[PDB]
Amino acid sequence: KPWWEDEWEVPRETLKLVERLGAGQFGEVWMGYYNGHTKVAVKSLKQGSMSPDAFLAEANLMKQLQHQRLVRLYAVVTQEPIYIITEYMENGSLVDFLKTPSGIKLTINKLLDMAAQIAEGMAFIEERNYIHRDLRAANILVSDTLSCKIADFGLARLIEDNEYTAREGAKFPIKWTAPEAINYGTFTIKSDVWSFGILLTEIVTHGRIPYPGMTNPEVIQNLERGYRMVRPDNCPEELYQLMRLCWKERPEDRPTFDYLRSVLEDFFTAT
Numbered sequence: 001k002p003w004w005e006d007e008w009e010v011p012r013e014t015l016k017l018v019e020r021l022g023a024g025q026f027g028e029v030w031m032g033y034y035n036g037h038t039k040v041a042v043k044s045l046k047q048g049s050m051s052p053d054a055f056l057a058e059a060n061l062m063k064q065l066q067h068q069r070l071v072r073l074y075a076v077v078t079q080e081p082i083y084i085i086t087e088y089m090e091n092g093s094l095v096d097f098l099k100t101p102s103g104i105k106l107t108i109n110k111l112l113d114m115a116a117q118i119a120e121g122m123a124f125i126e127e128r129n130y131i132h133r134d135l136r137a138a139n140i141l142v143s144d145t146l147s148c149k150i151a152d153f154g155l156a157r158l159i160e161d162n163e164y165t166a167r168e169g170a171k172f173p174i175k176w177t178a179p180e181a182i183n184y185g186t187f188t189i190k191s192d193v194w195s196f197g198i199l200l201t202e203i204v205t206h207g208r209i210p211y212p213g214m215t216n217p218e219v220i221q222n223l224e225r226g227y228r229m230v231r232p233d234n235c236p237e238e239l240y241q242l243m244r245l246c247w248k249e250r251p252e253d254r255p256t257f258d259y260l261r262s263v264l265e266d267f268f269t270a271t
């Protein structure tokens, strides 16, 4: 729809950027207020860094993925400077929050609770026929009630045949990304499952880098021998075996997010 009929377009004055949370090559992230009283996050595009259509495509993907377990789209401003406005999460990214005094005091039980919540959200994405493509703790946000939501949907894609294929020069984070997407550019929901397995380690280690002590080429080589990540410190053997399911050789042998979600709630109500 044209901006004048767009239910998502808002006039810029309704917004007040208060605190800049982050800044980078492509824009800034602010805490702000909508119409005075409502805390919101505001993503703003650095003019010239990328096309506005490229930027705005994030807000169009989010429009299609509405669910309590995913970060909710709020509005857009489509005249420069371009804004994407969303649900505000007070405890920031999962990987940062796990390092704070609060985060450190969390039981394994609450940790498993959060794992289940993230899996619950990926269960919704999966059934909507989407993939995320960048699932990892840095892309999980935390609420003021220690709730978890999936975020950063820029790489998300609609699957009509469960397989999106990236450019031949496209690069992705090697430690978080399934072999087949690394090797062939082929992304399925089962690639997200492999990444979720990696995510489970960050959770149990409070935001530590996966495959401790290893370079990217070492990870590739070890994985190709049939090894997987060494058991993290303070990681229940049950969870580790759920990680191993996530990291199976054949994409199709890895579990659905619905299964992972059901298992982790069992783990959690058992602790």
Ligand SMILES: COc1cc(Nc2nn3c(NCC(C)(C)N)cc(C4CC4)nc3c2C(N)=O)cc(OC)c1
Residues within 6 Å of the ligand: 021, 022, 029, 040, 041, 043, 071, 086, 087, 088, 089, 090, 091, 092, 093, 138, 139, 140, 141, 151, 152, 153
């Ligand atoms: C990073 O530092 C902080 C960020 C935030 N908030 C946020 N960062 N953040 C992103 N940042 C990028 C990410 C961290 C998710 N990779 C990406 C997205 C996508 C657009 C929904 N949303 C957000 C929010 C949000 N919706 O609240 C809050 C903090 O409070 C202490 C600290």
